[PDB]
Ligand binder design. Structure first.
Ligand SMILES: CCCCCCCC/C=C\CCCCCCCC(=O)O[C@H](COC(=O)CCCCCCCCCCCCCCC)COP(=O)(O)OC[C@@H](O)CO
Ligand SMILES: CCCCCCCC/C=C\CCCCCCCC(=O)O[C@H](COC(=O)CCCCCCCCCCCCCCC)COP(=O)(O)OC[C@@H](O)CO
Ligand SMILES: CCCCCCCC/C=C\CCCCCCCC(=O)O[C@H](COC(=O)CCCCCCCCCCCCCCC)COP(=O)(O)OC[C@@H](O)CO
Ligand SMILES: CCCCCCCC/C=C\CCCCCCCC(=O)O[C@H](COC(=O)CCCCCCCCCCCCCCC)COP(=O)(O)OC[C@@H](O)CO
Ligand SMILES: CCCCCCCC/C=C\CCCCCCCC(=O)O[C@H](COC(=O)CCCCCCCCCCCCCCC)COP(=O)(O)OC[C@@H](O)CO
Ligand SMILES: CCCCCCCC/C=C\CCCCCCCC(=O)O[C@H](COC(=O)CCCCCCCCCCCCCCC)COP(=O)(O)OC[C@@H](O)CO
Ligand SMILES: CCCCCCCC/C=C\CCCCCCCC(=O)O[C@H](COC(=O)CCCCCCCCCCCCCCC)COP(=O)(O)OC[C@@H](O)CO
Ligand SMILES: Nc1ncnc2c1ncn2[C@@H]1O[C@@H]2COP(=O)(O)O[C@H]2[C@H]1O
Ligand SMILES: Nc1ncnc2c1ncn2[C@@H]1O[C@@H]2COP(=O)(O)O[C@H]2[C@H]1O
Ligand SMILES: Nc1ncnc2c1ncn2[C@@H]1O[C@@H]2COP(=O)(O)O[C@H]2[C@H]1O
Ligand SMILES: Nc1ncnc2c1ncn2[C@@H]1O[C@@H]2COP(=O)(O)O[C@H]2[C@H]1O
Lengths: 390, 390, 390, 390
């Protein structure tokens, strides 16, 4: 909460140097009134390494290499050493790609940093171009504006051609910044293409898998009604949970977090068991992790009155109805929370009523063999179960 | 069926505003005859929020901010507030990316929306450029056509340079729209690249996997004839089912849909069992989900007369022949639907005839151990089986 | 072998129409000597549908819509209907993306087709531009060359600007072909980007996985020597089999092809068993599919004299040495083909000699429990084994 | 160490030929003083095939096809055969993509090679353009600089248009190099886009999976506190091990390397067992590979005093505390290396103390059933265990 201000200030002073140094390098008339803010900015920059404490850009930028050759006059070719502290931008970018890189998309952050670098380099190239120019009597503002317009035209690969170089040195400068502008335009194109490509992931993956399964059944000469049912089920899955499988997403979590997730999910179902009031937490903790989720569409047969039957079902989201053997006299209707199929684990007996799903159910299924496997090691719970069984 | 007309009308009125508002902003001579259609369009726009009932663009666009400053004359710099309702395009795009985004490729929809935005922005920029221009005596049509040609030339990064800015404000406008045009050209390039990259998926994945396996066997000093056989098998798989594995595509479906798919597939094979007429549906439902699909090429040995043999085979698509032990006297020829290998489950006896595949078979195999496991729990079916066994 | 000539001829006649029709549309002086070749080409085109026998481009292109309005003079605006047969290119591309799409990369084929379409469209646009031009006394060759140069300059987004439109219709044509050229340049950029991205797959996947594992061990404070050993092993794997796992590539094949591959691999090892001369093919066929491949680096301990030991090893590629318990008196040296570790399955006895690997071995391991499981069902082979055991 | 100099020399001589041959082809005044270095370079090139010993570029480049037609004067159209040895660049690239392709990213190497080819082709095209030019009295340096500037302007799709072709042959040359420049700019764009897209992999994959799981729990109406806990756990995993699962990264290694990794990891834990001083290496080697890693967050319940308990835990990185049943009297605090939970394998007894994690633990868990399975086959270790059990 107290270092964010420092990081913002160091970014601001680096950006101010980037704007200022070439502008006062081309113009000797400047830097006369800009003494105190520059002095305090230089103090802020040199007061960076002790707070930070690889180190090379910081070492090469922290020393007051400026403020001497602005009045200590030297020829132009050796005067280019005033841009050594411009390497502060690299450290600023390396710090910004770690302090806030997770709030936004890293590709977006890289693109924004590249755009800022483009603007700074365009300003620097415009300053250099207007420096490397025959002298004339004209206002400074128009002279800088023309240079900026020309460097924007060159860097964007548009090439209006209204103004063209004349002397060979201008032509060489144009060639080198033409290669530079082409390279940076390529970088921007690549960044935008990558960001666009890595934008739609789930909506394309679900479409690809539904297309694959639709083509596969279309080969198998399947009936159109079943095709419509499967397409509707996939559309429902995409609309509900964005086409993510249950057990394929509840696997990255470790054991305790998965157990906590299951407990929070079934905290409204575990205490509504008529055959077990909750006399024991270890048994509930063991049985809660072995629930197998299944999805039943509208009109699907969950349990048929007449089959053997060995599985119990816990209703989680949808609503289900219970019908008779002849499917003409409805017995009862169930909803979320309350479960059914309890007369399948206490003895090996056939089912009694046919259960038909009205809408999408999102119910969880517990089998028989795993239940027996994880109940056989608890004798007290077993006694409490077969005392109520008969 | 009654809201699609409303959505089309709101898209039409938004597009009409986008075309109209800058054109009548630059031209004070217009808007004189265009009273009633504008009034009804404004009523249609303001009658959007009650039908809809985040809300910010709708609130900022629904109010009749226009129709007052068209005759209530104000200076140009503050007159730009007539484009507030142009934010309706964002809501239109957000509604279109949900009402019909699944009929076509989402990347294609995004590209088309971007192209429409490009055209609208080009028209707006042309109107602004012809507004920011020294006055002259010329027809309005040619003056607008020149501006549109110039903004198309700038936005496409071509830069003919026949017409160039003169005043500094024209140069600043050119610079800002040059950055804008470069950005949107980058967006279009990225969208096209992503759409092209995400076009060929199966034809490239199958090619990659066949190249991988071909290189792997080429390392292992494998015989060329087996290489040709495997290449032909992979080509057949790609031609038939687009190179999709059976069990790797019949796994996204849940249990009931998979059971229905299996039932629909084997609805012509389950009733053609000579050893079981169908006295029981639970047994058929249990055995239908455990069938293991295999593919046999031309000339492959399915069953050899002399081996032990424990598996039964159901023919699904291809045709197979039955040969004798000496492979000189053909016994019978089989086709789809009818199965063989039934004298392998009722007792532990060696095979009798050698079965050779003529063409690609696409037959399904059922093993012995799983069959015994899922038959041991049905005593009546077991009695009905070993009564016919001997 | 007889339809390839027909496909080449239909491609040639379509390309000839594409070159010819606009050129003789702009030039009324042509088509005078080009009667017979055009007549036979039209006969070849109209003789396409009976050989082929969706059908719409073929129907719209097969009829002799040309050869009437070349001398049956009509005004220019309605004369554009002579390009209806240019839709033959779509059918040609759809046929070419199936007749030879698997010899080369599909992305490369799409790029080449797009380049051909670019050239044809550039020629057509040049013809249209030189048609829409004020009349002048100049040679036809130079007039066509200037138009082609201009349309290449426009389509490549270069924009020299030496020649510019003057009349409004020329400006409209320039605008529409500018949008067209931008769109096709975007398509070419996207195709090239996709082809480059989908070029290096294995060399990048292996690099990514080795970087992942190197970083993971670098976190775990692992010794540098083990890091060097693992890096060398990964480099050896990439150099040898392009970084493809054995069991992860021998799984796409079905059961019979995998069995044939295993038989061809071990056709030099299965007959060199001193404890079993080969009295039975079913046992060999059963044991050949359960071999587990492992890789041992230089200096790794395969078997230590003193451990319990339950696995047998078959040498496939590398060479291994056998040392004594004290690792000072070498017993024997082995190479590919010949196996060792046979005194581990016939009784539960401890190992006798320490086996150390010299170079990379690529040997296959067979365990004890699976061997017993697949031998217990063969009593004769069991008797033949324990008769030689003692 | 002695062939790298030779490869550098062959690259240098090929690059020197690439720079030199067109420059002395356009200028007949050159090549007069450049006899001896050219002679030794030709000897070095012709002395390449014997050291190397497909061969076609080497054969076509090794022979001294130059040095004859530089003074043996022939007309220009047939003089283009002096560029046959320029195919040496293809062999140089093919050698460079194998000698050092693994030190850097292969995409980066391809991009750098393409950039070098761009520079060489630009120089060659500039030489050709200044050759195909009307004669004039001007310095050679300015004449070459203008040509280089023009070819850079053309190849970068900028098109200043200050200088334009006049004769038809210049226009044809401009057209062909315009297509060439567009193609190579597309190649550069594609390479940059691929390199950018294949740059951020782990930081994007972890973000995608955490977004997927966050959305999935957001659907399930999960409590915000558990969401915060899971988000913090995922952030910790990314900060610590870059979001790589343990068992999903310790699977590419084969059996011996994995065993060595486990031994090096537990070389500080295996010798700190109070119940077993280390009387046997086979038992330790067997039990070390079956450890199951788990991650426990701050405040998670590892062991509760009152549960049954069957697993032992080895602390690896984090620190854990031990509390009493009532969680008011702390018993002891543990750290890395030292383990706990030992009173769970020697008999079936309930736990005694509740263990709560303070910070992230990174501890490893060993279960009961696998321990019994891999201990039952060692009778001496079993006797040594149950002698200390009681
Ligand atoms: C991330 C951001 C990165 C930004 C990177 C930017 C990269 C490019 C920017 C360069 C800044 C400007 C460089 C200007 C270099 C030239 C130096 C300059 O300011 O221009 C004049 C020279 O004119 C000249 O003909 C100099 C001719 C040579 C110019 C070379 C320019 C190279 C660039 C000054 O001398 P003037 O005449 O007053 O007499 C001095 C006499 O009194 C000695 O005491
Ligand atoms: C590399 C550039 C140099 C390449 C070598 C070519 C070179 O040096 O050319 C010279 C120009 O040098 C010069 O100072 C040219 C002026 C300086 C050019 C500076 C180029 C680097 C700019 C980097 C910006 C990065 C921005 C990142 C943000 C002049 O040659 P020329 O005999 O024809 O002149 C005759 C003339 O003096 C009248 O007789
Ligand atoms: C998704 C689609 C997004 C589209 C986004 C489009 C973005 C760009 C479009 C802008 C629309 C046109 C803006 C035009 C702004 C200028 C306003 C204008 O219409 O031009 C004239 C001003 O001329 C001028 O020199 C104005 C000079 C300043 C122009 C500033 C232009 C900024 C753009 C009108 O005044 P006129 O002379 O009649 O006297 C009025 C006097 O009588 C006050 O009563
Ligand atoms: C940001 C643009 C402004 C950047 C700041 C630069 C700036 O303001 O420059 C001024 C132009 O302003 C102006 O109104 C320039 C005219 C208005 C420019 C409007 C730019 C935004 C357009 C957005 C379109 C989005 C389309 C989306 C679809 C003039 O400076 P200068 O002292 O040289 O003039 C001297 C002259 O008055 C004669 O002495
Ligand atoms: C995959 C490949 C796709 C290729 C697609 C190509 C797309 C573009 C190519 C178009 C082909 C050329 C179209 C030329 C259309 C114009 C027709 C033309 O040939 O030009 C002259 C008209 O000049 C004119 O001013 C015509 C003015 C309107 C031109 C409209 C051009 C639209 C394009 C001919 O009339 P002319 O004067 O002899 O008097 C005739 C009198 O005697 C009536 O009997
Ligand atoms: C769409 C293009 C038309 C857009 C609508 C604009 C439009 O029609 O403009 C007209 C040009 O039409 C015209 O024939 C323009 C000539 C025909 C343009 C043909 C464009 C389609 C070319 C497709 C090539 C695909 C290649 C694929 C390979 C002339 O308007 P304007 O009142 O200023 O004239 C005044 C003048 O007559 C002197 O007073
Ligand atoms: C990876 C790198 C790849 C690089 C690939 C580069 C590809 C392009 C480069 C070409 C090199 C230069 C080619 C120059 C070809 C022309 C040959 C040349 O040097 O130019 C003059 C011809 O002028 C002419 O009008 C020649 C006219 C035709 C030019 C054709 C140029 C094609 C290119 C020389 O004859 P000059 O007058 O002295 O009389 C000779 C008389 O005395 C016969 O004895
Ligand atoms: N009257 C009823 N009220 C509520 N649920 C019932 C009723 N009758 C049957 N069921 C449920 O329907 C199921 C059908 O047979 P089960 O043995 O699975 O257990 C049964 C109960 O779960
Ligand atoms: N005459 C026949 N007609 C049809 N099928 C046969 C005939 N003889 C053998 N078969 C099939 O060939 C198989 C070879 O041995 P099986 O025990 O697998 O069972 C046999 C039958 O499926
Ligand atoms: N003299 C020998 N020649 C060849 N191989 C041997 C010799 N002595 C031992 N071996 C091999 O070394 C192995 C060590 O113990 P095994 O029981 O695995 O079986 C042994 C043989 O495979
Ligand atoms: N006084 C103690 N000092 C260190 N560890 C203990 C102490 N008491 C209990 N523990 C640990 O806490 C565990 C709780 O029950 P366990 O049977 O898992 O084995 C116990 C020991 O690992």
């Amino acid at each position: 909460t107290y270092t964010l201000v420092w990081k913002v200030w160091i970014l601001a002073v680096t950006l101010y140097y980037a704007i200022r140094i070439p502008l006062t390098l081309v113009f000797p008339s400047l830097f006369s009134p800009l003494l105190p803010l520059d002095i305090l900015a230089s103090l802020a920059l040199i007061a960076d390494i002790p707070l930070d404490l690889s180190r090379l850009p910081d070492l090469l930028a922290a020393l007051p290499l400026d403020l001497l050759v602005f009045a200590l006059h030297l020829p132009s070719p050796l005067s280019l050493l005033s841009l050594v502290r411009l390497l502060k931008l690299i450290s600023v970018q390396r710090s910004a790609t770690r302090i806030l890189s997770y709030r936004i998309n890293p590709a977006l952050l890289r693109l924004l940093s590249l755009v800022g670098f483009i603007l700074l380099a365009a300003h620097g190239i415009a300053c250099g171009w207007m420096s490397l120019q025959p002298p004339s009597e004209n206002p400074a503002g128009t002279r800088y504006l023309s240079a900026f317009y020309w460097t924007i035209t060159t860097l964007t690969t548009i090439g209006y051609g209204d103004i063209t170089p004349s002397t060979p040195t201008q032509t060489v400068y144009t060639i080198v910044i033409e290669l530079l502008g082409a390279a940076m335009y390529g970088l921007v194109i690549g960044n935008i293409a990558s960001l666009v490509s890595k934008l739609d992931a789930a909506k394309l993956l679900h479409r690809e898998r539904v297309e694959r399964v639709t083509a596969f059944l279309s080969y198998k000469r399947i009936s159109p009604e079943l095709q419509r049912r499967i397409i509707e089920y996939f559309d429902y899955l995409w609309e509900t949970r964005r086409g993510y499988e249950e057990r394929e997403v509840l696997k990255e979590l470790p054991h305790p977090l998965r157990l906590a997730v299951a407990m929070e999910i079934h905290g409204d179902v575990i205490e509504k068991v008529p055959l077990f009031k909750g006399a024991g937490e270890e048994f509930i903790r063991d049985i809660i992790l072995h629930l197998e989720p299944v999805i039943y569409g509208p009109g699907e047969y969950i349990i048929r009155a007449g089959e053997m039957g060995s599985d119990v079902y816990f209703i989680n989201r949808g609503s289900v109805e219970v019908l008779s053997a002849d499917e003409k006299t409805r017995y009862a209707i169930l909803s979320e929370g309350q479960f059914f199929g309890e007369m399948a684990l206490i003895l090996r007996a056939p089912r009694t009523a046919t259960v038909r799903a009205r809408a999408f159910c999102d119910l969880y299924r517990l089998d028989k063999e795993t239940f027996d496997r994880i109940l056989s090691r608890y004798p007290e719970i077993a006694a409490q179960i077969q005392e109520l069984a008969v």
